[model samples]
Target: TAPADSLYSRMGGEAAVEKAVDVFYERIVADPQLAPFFANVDMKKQRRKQVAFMTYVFGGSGAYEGRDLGASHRRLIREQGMNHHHFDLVAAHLDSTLQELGVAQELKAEAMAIVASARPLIFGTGE
Candidate 1:
């Protein structure tokens, strides 16, 4: 496969990414443990940023201009008690979202791997 043929395309491109973000956040904000983090957040804006970030990471069109993962979540870690458990929960939710969306196993695995790659940064423990 050509590098030009990105995972974003394999996973169904723009519409699919948007749908995944929509469903992912719906699941997220409904989770008791995760809901609090979003209580003060603007979900509509948050969802847009998430879609952009996912698309950029999945090798799709567009650059990711959002704040860096580590820096962006700093306050949550410092004040609102973000932790590995929370990260894992979010990751699990994302996995479930992909599964529920009927994403192919191989594609889902790659997606999860990409998400996993950010764990250290999300915790501000990355170099």
Candidate 2:
């Protein structure tokens, strides 16, 4: 396993993560279905928050003091009926965004690994 610092450095820290978020959301905004979710959200603020959140997820900065992932996503699941397919789409967007940013393979793998690990938590059991 790569050390946290190495992962952080490889990901190019906050700036790169911010760029990735920008790219990801750009794609989301272009999607009719997903755009509604972010319709009222301030793009700039969302980008910054995404950077902080990803930073924390990648074992970098301790600046992402937000709601826990499962709890944060529960509303989406309960209200929006967000399921594994929706979560997978978001992950796919992230992966494509990272690729567009020319992220290194190892770093991309690490990011994907995080997404994969969170699948169950985000989607819950198909109960």
Candidate 3:
């Protein structure tokens, strides 16, 4: 079990992460600007990875077994022209996901902060 005070536990654990990723990817694949980035991608696998990754980041169980974030997104950054603006657009969907799910303000802030910290990896700006 996750710690009582863990962000994972506070965010409602497995169900919340799964739901958030579902909503987040729905918005992502629907957006014209973002759709192209995921056009040829396999969502079935993507969602699972997201759930697992978020669970790990939120201090829950299971490690993220996927490839490195920056390395994995390198193609999108170089070919799809994914940049800071695109990252922000994706982040907006996450914001809405938390809001629509009725997550508390403090929890939402914590979640968003974690996402914010991942920007460098997503943008290949981190070493």
Candidate 4:
């Protein structure tokens, strides 16, 4: 992964992460409850950007670029009544992907813990 070792390198690097991203979105779009959210969204572009971005997030690009996470998500909430379920669905896809890839639950729980803490405001507490 990414030619040598890092968190993602051990995880099979960019190619593996890309596959996970594809599967993650695919699972979402295939879901009856989730598919319609992307009925008008361009997932090909989304997956491409996500995989590219995740490459860095996994550390191949050396540093983090935690940008646009809010606006990227909030537009949907603005369009509809987005809430914890939507966020949970996303993490479900991610953790589900991790599970299929055989990643441990401790890691998934670790990631979700960080995600949950971010949303006290996102749940429209607007703090």
Candidate 5:
């Protein structure tokens, strides 16, 4: 496996993840449609989870062993009616956040690849 620090370093480490989470959540909360979904949730906890999950996903640490993508997001699609548009919005914000942070070109490419590979699972378009 690649060195854990390599992935973490490439992603600008925890601080970058925290900033990305803040930017992403700000966009989500500012949108009337997206805001309702998070109305009752504790924002601090949500941000922490976002950071931890992204850290694990990007190979920083395994501290996040939460539900896999399919299980975690299946109910959102089937019950809450999340669609590709919502997914696209989140993805776009994430990309923009990384770009705003001046992440390296190669790191951005890797990040995009990670998101692309998870699209199927997130959208529940597979068996």
Candidate 6:
């Protein structure tokens, strides 16, 4: 069980993470910009059982059993490229996913604001 007042608890439940991921996957896979990249590529997720479940369910290792992901993602970036346009589309899809799931817009905005706070690091422009 999740702790009361936990981020997931307040947001909707741990399952919500999986739900959004599912919708995000569908959205990204359907994007004309991303279709070619996803072909022969089966990137997938769970809220950590939810994620593991989708891992296998979507043609992955099925479960992580706990390990490092940094290396895996580095490979993705080295092989696949994305700049602001792709990143913005991904963010848009996430916001839409939250809205489609009935999450309040203000809270969604708040989450984006949180991301903005770390934008410098994300862009590696910490100067």
What TM-score number comes out for model 6?
0.59
Between candidates 1 and 3, the one scoring higher on TM-score is 1
Cα lDDT of model 3 by residue, 16-118, tens digit? 7766777877897899998887778786767655764565456533445466778777887898788899889888888998899898998888878877877
| Superposition error at 90 for model 5 (Å) | 0.5
Candidate achieving the largest TM-score = 1
Q: Give the per-residue Cα lDDT of candidate 3 at 92.
A: 89
**lDDT of each residue in 1-127, candidate 4, tens digit only:** 2433234555565587667667776787787777777777776666555754464334433444454456656777887666678778866776787788786676556544544554654555554
Q: Model 1 Cα displacement at 75 (Å)?
A: 0.7
lDDT of 5 by residue, 22-126 (tens): 776687667777776667669665755575457545653344535577876677789888788886776777688778878788887777676666678777665
Candidate that beats the other on lDDT, 2 or 5, i.e. the better one:
2
Compare the candidates by lDDT and give the number of the best one: 1
Better of 2 and 6 by TM-score: 2
- The full ranking of all candidates by lDDT, starting with the best, is 1, 3, 2, 5, 4, 6
Which tens-of-lDDT digit does each residue in 5-124 have in candidate 6? 234444565566567667876787688986765676543332342353223222122233333433433444566774456657756766677678787776667555543443343344
The TM-score obtained by model 3 is 0.83
Give the poorly placed runs of model 3, Cα more than 4 Å off.
Answer: 1-5, 60-62
- RMSD (Cα, Å) for all candidates, in order, is 3.0, 3.5, 2.6, 4.0, 3.1, 7.0
Q: Name the weakest run of 10 consecutive residues (lDDT summed) in model 1.
A: 56-65
- By TM-score: ranked, best first: 1, 3, 2, 5, 4, 6
Q: Single out the weakest 10-residue window by summed lDDT for candidate 4.
A: 1-10
Measured against the true structure, the TM-scores of the candidates, in listed sequence, are 0.84, 0.75, 0.83, 0.69, 0.75, 0.59
Error of 2 at 81 (Å): 1.9
Backbone clash numbers for all candidates listed: 0, 0, 0, 0, 0, 5
Stretches of model 4 off by over 4 angstroms after superposition: 1-6, 52-57, 60-67, 104-126
